[PDB]
């Protein structure tokens, strides 16, 4: 017999100073935080891709309904939500012919084909950025399904320095120019026409169309420079940081690159959420612990960024990771940290197999239920049942996060509240919440993009150039 505590659902701040718990409800009822006047889009691909993009953009403007609106709120139209214009009349189209695609698409090798396709798609972007007089907010790269299927690291042809992934290499090669691009698939916007066996579409968006519209609109609005929502219950000068380690694979010797994501509250009552980059490297294979010098450099850079943004030093700095810090790297961390600042290192994992089944009901466990094992351990149900939407966020019994304070002293309830609030800042999607904290997820995205190339020297901190 054990006791579970309940963590109150956090709120996110929308326009007019109004708070809500659901991003879709707050965006439909109130609207985004900031006002940008319009979105000018640049489309790349074949003429069929342009027609598909124009058709989807025209379809977006009118309201779209889901099959069951009690779980997925309907999309009321882009202008009726974001009070800004994203139309098909402001499209700067760059043409990519099928012959050019097929010149390198059907050729041999997996690294050369992807490199050539990425070069063909990216030279147009660079030239139109430098040698054209039209201002483009977001560049929408429509990729035919053949390129998506045939540009995987483990892909095999159907019997006739850079990563083999099309998306990661494409985003890495575009870092020196700071061009926010959204990669779309033809089957994503034209799912109704990509049938498989007897006219049945490969992907069924019939009952989802509203949610797809919500996600696409939110991503486009964020990449264009808009602020859809912000956290309302952020604490004092405390700063949250998150470290994620990645393998640089067979590029240049066994190496591990660590990338960080940073969040805090500025003096303008908003939220600063960017990335600490310059992936710090470790030459030892299989070790995910930062060397002392690189750890000191990381903490010094993050502290300097916070001091420049605010004007003083943070009261306490929380650190999240999927691994457990050792003593040497923690001592290196503390050597730089000022006395007034309190260092807390927290480890969040999703590996402990603790499944809770409801005794009678057919639904899963309520989201937010927490099992405090002891002072420095807890099990948090970030994914589960949400009373507002009469369905769970998972399919089977969800797995809970195992949050354990590795280093330093801090209240476990406060840590759980901070993590549950951090899980609300996913701008890559318009959902209720996600299991993983957004800091770790965005550090994951940043690392998996920055590990796809080696020519990057000073990567940008903003998130619109990665997500």
């Amino acid at each position: 017999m054990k006791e579970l505590i309940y963590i109150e659902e956090p709120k996110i701040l929308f326009a007019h100073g109004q708070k809500c718990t659901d991003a879709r409800d707050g965006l439909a009822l109130f609207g985004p935080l900031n006002n940008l006047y319009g979105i000018k889009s640049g489309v790349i691909g074949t003429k069929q891709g342009l027609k598909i993009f124009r058709d989807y953009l025209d379809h977006i403007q009118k309201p779209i309904y889901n099959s069951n609106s009690i779980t997925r709120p309907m999309f009321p139209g882009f202008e009726a939500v974001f009070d800004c214009k994203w139309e098909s009349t402001g499209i700067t189209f760059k043409e990519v012919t099928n012959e050019d695609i097929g010149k390198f698409l059907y050729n041999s090798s997996t690294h050369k084909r992807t490199y050539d396709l990425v070069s063909l798609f990216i030279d147009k972007i660079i030239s139109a950025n430098k040698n054209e007089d039209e201002n483009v907010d977001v560049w929408f790269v429509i990729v035919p399904d053949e390129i998506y299927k045939y540009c995987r690291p483990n892909s095999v042809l159907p019997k006739e320095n850079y990563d083999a992934q099309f998306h990661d290499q494409f985003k890495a090669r575009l870092l020196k120019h700071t061009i926010p691009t959204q990669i779309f698939r033809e089957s994503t916007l034209a799912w109704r026409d990509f049938k498989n066996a007897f006219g049945l579409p490969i992907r069924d968006f019939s009952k989802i169309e509203g949610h797809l519209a919500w996600t696409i609109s939110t991503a486009a609005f964020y990449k264009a420079g808009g602020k859809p929502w912000k956290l309302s219950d952020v604490r004092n000068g405390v700063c949250y940081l998150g470290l994620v380690y990645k393998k640089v694979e067979k590029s240049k010797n066994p190496r591990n690159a660590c990338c960080a994501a940073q969040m805090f509250l500025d003096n303008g009552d908003g939220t600063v959420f960017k990335g600490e980059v310059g992936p710090w490297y470790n030459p030892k294979n299989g070790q995910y612990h930062l060397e002392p010098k690189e750890a000191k450099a990381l903490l010094s850079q993050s502290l300097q960024s916070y001091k420049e943004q605010i004007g003083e030093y943070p009261k306490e700095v929380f650190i999240h990771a999927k691994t457990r810090f050792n003593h040497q790297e923690w001592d290196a961390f503390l050597e730089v940290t000022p006395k007034e600042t309190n260092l807390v290192g927290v480890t969040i994992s999703k590996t402990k197999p603790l499944k809770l089944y409801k005794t009678e009901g057919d639904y899963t466990i309520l989201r937010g239920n927490a099992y405090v094992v002891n002072e420095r351990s807890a099990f948090l149900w970030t994914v589960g049942y949400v009373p507002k939407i009469q369905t769970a966020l998972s399919m089977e019994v969800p797995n809970p996060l195992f949050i354990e304070i590795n280093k330093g002293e801090a209240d476990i309830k406060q840590v759980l509240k901070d993590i549950l609030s951090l899980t609300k800042l996913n701008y890559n999607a318009c959902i209720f919440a996600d299991g993983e904290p957004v800091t770790l997820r965005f550090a994951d995205k940043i690392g998996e993009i920055l590990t796809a190339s080696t020519d990057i020297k000073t990567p940008p901190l903003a998130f619109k150039y990665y997500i």
């Binding site: 017999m1 054990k2 006791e3 579970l4 505590i5 309940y6 659902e9 007019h16 109004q18 708070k19 809500c20 659901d22 409800d25 439909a28 009822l29 109130f30 309201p63 309904y65 609106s69 009690i70 709120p73 309907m74 402990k352 197999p353 603790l354 499944k355 809770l356 089944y357 409801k358 005794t359 009901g361 057919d362 639904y363 899963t364 466990i365 309520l366 239920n369 099992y371 094992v373 002891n374 351990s377 049942y385 009373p387 507002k388 009469q390 399919m395 089977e396 019994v397």
Partner: protein
Amino acid sequence: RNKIFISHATPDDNDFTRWLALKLIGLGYEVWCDILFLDKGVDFWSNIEKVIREDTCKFLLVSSSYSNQREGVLKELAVAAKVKKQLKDDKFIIPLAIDEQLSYDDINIDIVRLNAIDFKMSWARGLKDILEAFEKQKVPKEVASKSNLLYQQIFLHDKSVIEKEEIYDSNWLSILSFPEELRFHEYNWMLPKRFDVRELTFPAVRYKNYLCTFAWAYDFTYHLKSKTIRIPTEEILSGSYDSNFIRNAECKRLIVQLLNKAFELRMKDKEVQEYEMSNKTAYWLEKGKLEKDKFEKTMLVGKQKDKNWHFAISGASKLYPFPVLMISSHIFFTADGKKLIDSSSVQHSSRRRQGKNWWNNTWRTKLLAFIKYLSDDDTSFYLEMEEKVFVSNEPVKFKGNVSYNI
């Protein structure tokens, strides 16, 4: 009379007034405000007076710090009071408190007595209150699906949990009784101290120069005092032991290895085949082992179309926070009742297809049935090392103070 008149300070309270007017129009009502419906080139004060006198059925008054002593708002309020007196309608004037900086003692007396609607905390809760008041007062409304959807969204936006206790069943099998002590046998003889380490009938692994086991020295005679230390289990579970002979964490690792080996060997003798995974091992029952695959009416083993699926349990002992066994559930597909498939992709795809229509109730029922069938007595089952460890067949329970009502 179907209009809803909205009064406000025009150059200071436009945002909330426009928001409320558009929301009310979207819900099927007909509203009148001077920022959206006043015409150009018209005598505006006479038009406002005529609208108040002959058109409005309700009079919403945005009461804030700006409009508390605004002359136009006061004139409209006075005319509204006269019209309410003529109409004998007590609920004609509804003040909406949208400002938290307006003290209760500073509100003008004409609307102090009236029951306002709180908009300071949240505009959505205030809109819900407005909708409830309008529905109760039978305010005329002329809507078709869009209005209903918006109304449902506004009502449901604030849905939350209820403080009702609930009981959750986990998948952790707790440990009740541990053996008297952990045995270290300093033999070093008997074929390089039992060089097999993987064939003895009772669980045991080799330490530096000792064998760690809960069994006696005269029990491995089929495949094969001076036993020192002999640490008790109760004293070492609390982690109060030290010294250079063996570290406490290494002791915990040794004992958890012992329970894992015991769990493997005990029910490897149950004449039940197993499945090999990437990192662990899972064990599923055969088609003919159960008569007839309905243990406690739980439908343990079935078939999808022509392939037979089997429920499997994979167990592993752990000591953190306190000694229990974590057991997980899997689904394994075989063409026949007793066979195996080497196609990993087909097995995975069919498993994902089978797991899409089970849900929490079926998962818990099958898990409990499998864990009850593996039992050896009324309320537990024992593992053998000449000693025995009793493991409860009922998983531990969790209590929550909040829940929902479907």
